[PDB]
Design a protein around this nucleic acid. Structure first.
Lengths: 45, 34, 198, 91, 101, 131, 236, 58
RNA sequence: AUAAUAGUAAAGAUGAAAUAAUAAUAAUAAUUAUAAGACUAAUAUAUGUGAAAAUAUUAAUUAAAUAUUAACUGACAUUGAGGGAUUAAAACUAGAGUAGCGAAACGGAUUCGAUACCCGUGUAGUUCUAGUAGUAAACUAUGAAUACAAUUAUUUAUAAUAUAUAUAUAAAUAAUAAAUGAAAAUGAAAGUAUUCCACCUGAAGAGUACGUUAGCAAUAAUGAAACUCAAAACAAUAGACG
RNA sequence: AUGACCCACCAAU
């Protein structure tokens, strides 16, 4: 369970540094759009 | 005033003496069948 | 910066210490740092403490624990005078084995234990002033306080007449002693030996 | 030969001073003259009537926090241990 | 009921945890350079009692009513809970006050 | 729960000093056992002249054989043990005090707890060393 | 007292008298306290950051600003008691000027108590002209003291010539010892040499050590002359 | 919700494992004796028969 | 108190003395020894713990009461007419007990007198057990709750620190600022505000009469009017007085 | 000024 928090938090959080690498991400899947990060990030796992 | 309160004391004590005299009248012919 | 200024303040150069100003406990190492004042400031009645030191004080050396306190006064004892004892150690000219000085002469993350001479000595152990030292006079306790440092009196033969000569004033009488040597127990205590020339 | 109350006998270890060698000093000192105190549940010693025998005016009496000077809790548990020891046969 | 105990100590866990020792004891000796002798049964008799005492020394029949209650509140919360965990639901709080009442 | 009985038994055998003491130590025990409860640690405290002459059964016992038994049983058995004790002419001044183990699973005897120790398993490895 | 009014309001007060007739000629000072108006606000103005330890005074750790289960292996989500105990007085409360150098000062003086015994020039002289290159544990004007050792360890931790504070201080600790060791020899040399070169000395350290002590003995001897004897009559 | 569940889970977990550790810390080894008629005879008869512990100290 | 014991002439009490079943029946004192009761020194600050009554000899059982996190609940509360519950000392009704204390009583003092103070016996009672009753200066003479406001020193709870230190929190206690106040003084309330309940409207007459309810009872609650005054009360001040 | 009256003392921590 704790693992989930790791990766889950880690990437959304990691996205802190990636408003560019998220670009790669934003695509794969497809403000509150930041909230859109946790949106599909959460689903992955 | 404590002195004023003490006067109550003299008055309650005086009434207690009357009560003792009234106590004789109480529990007597007046409070039984009347 | 205000703090930068204070971070270098002489007031802070002096560390804090609330050790009693009477310390009835047996004393070996000093408890506080004496504050030296130029005669000028003394007449100006200035000592750099929170409150000016009373003219009643005529020394130029005092020790302070509380810049100022609830009692609206500064807690200080104008009897700070270790300046004499340590100097007398120099007047006595004797070095301390200091256990073994591996590499560094005093050797030893934090050297809290076995601090070393404790600033009582910064001279090469061996020197030729030793020429049989300099028979420093000491006040026989029975042990003999030499230059403010008690040293056990030793002699070729026990001389009772010498003690009888001073009677009960054995400490009052001062006899020159060829100091055998001194040592700093890890508790920062100097143990030395005297040479009663009687 | 001389009386005790007039002659400091600083041990050699210490640092004797010119004043230090004075009567004033002697008077001064006089003026300014314990595993339980260390921090061990004083009650645990509900039996060991030996340990409790200490903080006792030697008259079956415990001491006001002017002498004992033990922590409120330490002293009260020490007092309770003494009272409990009275119940526990020994002392 | 008989065989109940305190602080979450279901007898089974005891049976299974106590059992762990059996596995461990023997397997500790399988390796190294020391052989197997009296450990053929490790005093079934002694181990039997060891556990026994444990049971007396952890038997509600020999503990404190407070402890039986500590067990109860749980039972109730777990019969009146809204989900695994909820302990604030009015019925949970009510049920809990009930045991005590 | 864990109880303790610093009882002071009397003695009469100019010879054996721990005669009755041991005989009673058996009694109490036999019963602490046949009743769901574990005896734990017994710590003979030997003999110590009583601070005062404790008159028991008009015998004025000036001394007694202190002893301690660390035991564990239901209230009743613990209560009952009190009854047994006072009512045992041999014992002179009994006492059962509690030793809550809520925090420490295994509690030592009061004594060791003031000796610095705290548990028998601890007090056992304390001697385990050997083998 | 209570924030008074008739203290910083003199001009207002005099003005009235000056406009009516109670006064005929203005109090000379009149203009000065007009040109330089008196600060009247006496507000307990608030503080926001500690002037020293650089700490901040005014922040809250919103939970989101955190995600690592505490050492106490636990992800905290709900704000905690203190984390909701309106701490406004703290802002006004003056913060403590904590300095790690002060710890080093005490540490050195504890390790070297004779340094405390050594006279120090606490009296601060025009602190303004004191720019000191501290790559060396010696400076013109400033004397030798454990304080120098402290200001020295700073280079070794600022410039980073060495590593942590403990190692840094020691590097200079041995630097200090040397200066002290050489000084000790220098001290003896003056005398020895001067002693072996036409030098006479009226009193030495041993001399004050004996004269003052023997002086004290005058009082003690006379004192016991009354105490011991008085008891003989007090008991005979 | 997920982190809350983990917080509640790790707490319950820590308490039970300690419970288990202490249970096999003494109940696993507590004299391995007192609980039977035979053993009591052994300990009691191995007490005053050789050693006695009193204060008095050294 | 009661024998045992040995010891001798007083004892004991008070300002000083009297007495009583004190002691020539051998007392008191002493030292042993039985029995009977109540109480609980130091510690011990009632710090504290309790709603308030209350409450510090020991233990056993039962039960309530802590802080801090964590999970949950999801405004579920603020406190309250009436009601209910508890409720000191005395008193009462049963049953046991009864050492000491001590109303009443009686005696001895003192005094002008002394149904007092003092002293000797000493009964109701003080103890328990089951009740009953429901009042105290049951007073911090200060109803409960919440939000807030300037300092210091001590407790002290407690986290933390690089435990033994100096720090951050709370909590209490003691001095105050402001503010309030007739002042005395209150001081995180007698301050700034909000909410709810109780209660007051001159003094006498009166917490009386009467009615009504409750009680085994003493009583408790409820609670008027006529008549008569310009009085009556409190904090601060001088002054006289002890 | 309204303004005929004032009355009690007993012995110590």
């Amino acid at each position: 369970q704790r693992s989930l928090i790791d990766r889950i938090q880690t990437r959304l959080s990691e996205l802190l540094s990636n408003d560019l690498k998220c670009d790669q991400f934003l695509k794969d899947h497809g403000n509150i759009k930041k909230n859109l990060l946790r949106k599909h990030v959460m689903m992955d796992m | 005033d404590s002195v004023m309160r003490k006067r109550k004391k003299k008055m309650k004590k005086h009434k207690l003496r009357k009560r003792r005299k009234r106590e004789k009248a109480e529990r007597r012919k007046l409070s039984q069948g009347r | 910066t205000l703090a930068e200024l204070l971070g270098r303040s002489r007031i802070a150069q002096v560390a804090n210490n609330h050790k009693p100003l009477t310390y009835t406990g047996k004393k070996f190492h000093p408890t506080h740092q004496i504050i030296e004042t130029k005669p000028s400031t003394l007449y100006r009645q200035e000592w750099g403490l929170k409150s000016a030191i009373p003219s009643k004080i005529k020394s130029r050396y005092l020790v302070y624990n509380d810049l100022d306190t609830l009692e609206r006064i500064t807690t200080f004892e104008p009897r700070g005078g270790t300046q004499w004892n340590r100097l007398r150690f120099q007047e006595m000219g004797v070095p301390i084995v200091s256990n073994i000085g591996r590499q560094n002469p005093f050797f030893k993350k934090f050297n809290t234990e076995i601090i070393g001479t404790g600033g009582l000595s910064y001279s090469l152990p061996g020197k030729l002033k030793v020429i049989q030292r300099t028979v420093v006079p000491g006040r026989i306790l029975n042990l003999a306080a030499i230059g403010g440092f008690v040293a056990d009196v030793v002699f070729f033969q026990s001389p009772p007449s010498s003690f009888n000569s001073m009677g009960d004033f054995i400490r009052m009488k001062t006899f020159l002693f060829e100091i055998l040597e001194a040592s700093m127990e890890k508790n920062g205590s100097v143990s030395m030996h005297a040479r009663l020339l009687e | 030969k001389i009386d005790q109350s007039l002659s400091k006998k600083l041990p050699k270890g210490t640092i004797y001073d010119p004043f230090d060698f004075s009567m004033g000093r002697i008077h001064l000192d006089r003026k300014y003259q314990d595993i339980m105190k260390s921090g061990a549940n004083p009650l645990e010693f509900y039996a060991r009537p030996r340990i409790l025998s200490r903080y006792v005016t030697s008259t079956g009496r415990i001491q006001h926090r002017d002498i004992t000077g033990l922590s409120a809790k330490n002293q009260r548990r020490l007092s309770k241990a003494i009272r409990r020891c009275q119940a526990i046969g020994l002392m | 009921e008989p065989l109940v105990l305190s602080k979450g100590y279901n007898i089974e866990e005891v049976d299974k945890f106590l059992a762990a020792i059996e596995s461990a004891k023997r397997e500790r000796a399988e390796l190294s350079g020391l052989n197997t002798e009296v450990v053929g049964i490790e005093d079934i008799e002694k181990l039997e009692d060891r556990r026994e005492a444990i049971l007396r020394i952890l038997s509600m029949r020999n503990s404190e009513n407070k402890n039986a209650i500590k067990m109860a509140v749980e039972l109730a919360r777990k019969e009146f809970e809204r989900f695994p965990g909820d302990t604030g639901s009015s019925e949970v709080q009510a049920a809990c006050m009930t045991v005590r009442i | 729960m864990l109880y303790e009985l610093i009882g002071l038994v009397r003695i009469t055998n100019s010879n054996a000093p721990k005669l009755e003491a041991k005989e009673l130590s058996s009694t109490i025990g036999k019963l602490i056992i046949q009743n769901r409860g574990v005896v734990r640690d017994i710590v003979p405290m030997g003999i110590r002249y009583l601070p005062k002459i404790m008159k028991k059964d008009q015998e004025k016992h000036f001394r007694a054989y202190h002893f301690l038994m660390l035991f564990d049983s239901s209230a009743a058995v613990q209560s009952e043990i009190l009854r047994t004790l006072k009512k045992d002419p041999r014992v002179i001044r009994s006492s059962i005090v509690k030793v809550d183990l809520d925090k420490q699973l295994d509690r030592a005897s009061s004594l060791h707890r003031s000796l610095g120790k705290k548990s028998i398993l601890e007090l056992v490895n304390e001697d385990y060393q050997s083998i | 007292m209570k924030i008074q009014t008739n203290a910083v309001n003199v001009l207002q007060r005099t003005s009235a008298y000056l406009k009516s007739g109670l006064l005929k000629e203005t109090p000379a000072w009149y203009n000065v306290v007009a040109s330089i108006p008196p600060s009247t606000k006496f507000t307990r103005e608030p503080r926001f950051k500690n002037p020293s330890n650089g700490h901040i005074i005014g922040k809250l750790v919103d939970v989101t600003e955190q995600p690592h289960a505490n050492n106490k292996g636990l992800y905290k989500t709900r704000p905690n008691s203190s984390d909701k105990r309106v701490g406004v007085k703290r802002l006004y409360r003056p913060p403590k000027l904590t300095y790690v150098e002060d710890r080093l000062r005490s540490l050195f003086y504890k390790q070297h108590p004779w340094e405390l015994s050594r006279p120090k020039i606490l009296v601060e002289n025009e602190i303004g002209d004191e720019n000191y290159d501290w790559s060396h544990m010696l400076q013109i004007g400033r004397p030798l003291d454990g304080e120098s050792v402290i200001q020295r360890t700073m280079y070794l931790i600022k410039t980073k010539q060495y590593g942590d504070m403990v190692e840094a201080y020691d590097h200079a600790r041995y630097e200090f010892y040397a200066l002290r060791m050489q000084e000790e020899t220098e001290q003896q040399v003056a005398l020895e040499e001067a002693e072996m070169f036409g030098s006479l000395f009226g009193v030495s350290a041993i001399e004050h050590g004996i004269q003052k002590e023997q002086e004290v003995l005058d009082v003690w001897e006379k004192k016991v002359v009354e105490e011991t004897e008085l008891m003989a009559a007090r008991t005979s | 919700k997920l982190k809350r569940n983990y917080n509640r889970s790790l707490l319950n977990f820590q308490a039970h494992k300690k419970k288990l550790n202490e249970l096999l810390n003494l109940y696993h080894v507590a004299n391995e004796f007192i609980v039977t008629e035979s053993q009591l005879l052994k300990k009691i008869d191995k007490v005053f028969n050789d050693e006695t512990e009193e204060f008095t100290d050294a």
